[PDB]
Every structure is written in C-alpha cells, then in structure tokens.
UniProtKB/TrEMBL annotation, chains A, B:
<feature type="domain" description="Integrase catalytic">
    <location>
        <begin position="1"/>
        <end position="127"/>
    </location>
</feature>
<protein>
    <recommendedName>
        <fullName>Gag-Pol polyprotein</fullName>
    </recommendedName>
</protein>
Length: 131, 131
C-alpha cells in the first residue's frame, strides 16, 4: 500500500541516523540527530506526515514508539502503527564531506535518484496514481 | 516550470524559519534554525534536492546564496540560481504546541493538505506528469 512507511535508527560515528523508507518505492528520507529520543522521533514523523500521505508506520524496534510525545504526533497526524546500501553510499562519499550529516544527505540523494525508474520517480508516480 | 523553487527565511520568536515553496504547486517544506547561516541554507538545499527534482532556486534576498558552502551545495546537486498564511496557520496552532518548531511543522501539514486539490496533491501530479 502507498501509505506505508518504515522508520528505523542506525548508528554511525557516535551519531544516530533516522531513516524512513517508503516501502512500495524504496524512496528514503533521513536526518542525523545526536541520539535516539522520543522528541526527535515525534518531530521527524510530523515532518514526514506533512510531505507525504502517511497512513502507517512500521519499525524493527517497537519500543521506540512508546513515548507520550511519539503517540501524540501519530495521533495529531492520523498515523497508525535499506541501511545496507545507504551505509555503502555514505562510505563512498564520506570523504567528500566534512560533517556526517552532509554525507548522509548526499547518500540519500544518490539513492533516490539512481536508476535501475528511480525511487524518487516511483514514489511520485505511486502517489499521484492513488489520488 | 516544475523544477522551480523559492526559498526564504522568516523570523519568529527569536528564531528563523527556512521556507521553501514549490512555485507551480504552492507545496511547502520548512525547518526552524537558531539563525540564518550559509551552513544551514546549504544543508537545507541538499535535503530538498534529494527529495524533489530541484532545477532552480529563487530567493527575495540574493546575498543569502553567496557563501562558499551554499555555492558548493548548488554545484554538487546541480541547482542553478506564502509566509502570509503560514504565519496565520502558525498563530492558530501555536497554543497547541510547546515548541515553535512543532507548530511550524503542524502549519506546514495544514497548508499542504488543505483543499480548495491540495498543494501536496498538485506537486505529486505536476512532477509525476513530467517524468
Ligand atoms: Mg530502529
Ligand atoms: Mg530570505
């Protein structure tokens, strides 16, 4: 279904990368934060939900969605309840950027635009088609 | 044209809101930062460019795109060179959230999803149609 997203955290250089994947397309959005917290996860979800018609979110760590602030964000936004190559691409460009956050966003760019259609083309088509 | 975006900063509560508008749709993305800096503007652009096929960016303050870090981001990403209602919507929900950043993202959500199609529907259609 086009409203389904997966969200997980990965760790790199003592920082945390929040990665959201649109399951039907493989499109990704990510952000770098200092550490995993409910406040960060809630903020990320609210941003995501304002961009895309987000219906359901899955995760590989259920406990990360247990805070009051995260349940509040899912409530208000009407939400119900890849790190393999992404880390490959980050390593490849890591040299080219000073800050890890900059390398992560270059990696997301590369991932979303690389063709086999690209993930970014597929999300827009999947969603436009459903309107 | 569907690759054209406008980016500007506004000030509220001693903070800065970076607002990007997809000119053909009226779709917006925003972020809250402590103050205007080239590093922030460059990061925002790199994020945006990884999400959408960004071709050209306009602004109402040209000097904000003069730093080395901003020119670097536009170079790597292949980029060449609403605050009215947004501030209305922020005021309306501001009470409902503690932190300004949370109110800004609720406002972006409201803006992008409100129908007359919504801005979020129009961007996806405009872009899908162009692929
Ligand atoms: Mg996780
Ligand atoms: Mg400005």
């Amino acid at each position: 279904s086009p409203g389904i997203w997966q969200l997980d955290c990965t760790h790199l250089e003592g920082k945390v990368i929040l990665v959201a994947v649109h399951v039907a397309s493989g499109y990704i959005e990510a952000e770098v934060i200092p550490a995993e917290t409910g406040q960060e996860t809630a903020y990320f979800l609210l941003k995501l939900a304002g961009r895309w018609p987000v219906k359901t979110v899955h995760t590989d760590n259920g406990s990360n969605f247990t805070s009051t602030t995260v349940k509040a964000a899912c409530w208000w936004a009407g939400i119900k309840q890849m790190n393999k190559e992404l880390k490959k691409i980050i390593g490849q460009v890591r040299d080219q950027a000073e800050h890890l956050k900059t390398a992560v966003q270059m990696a997301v760019f590369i991932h979303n635009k690389k063709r086999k259609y690209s993930a970014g083309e597929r999300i827009v088509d999947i969603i436009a088609t459903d309107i």
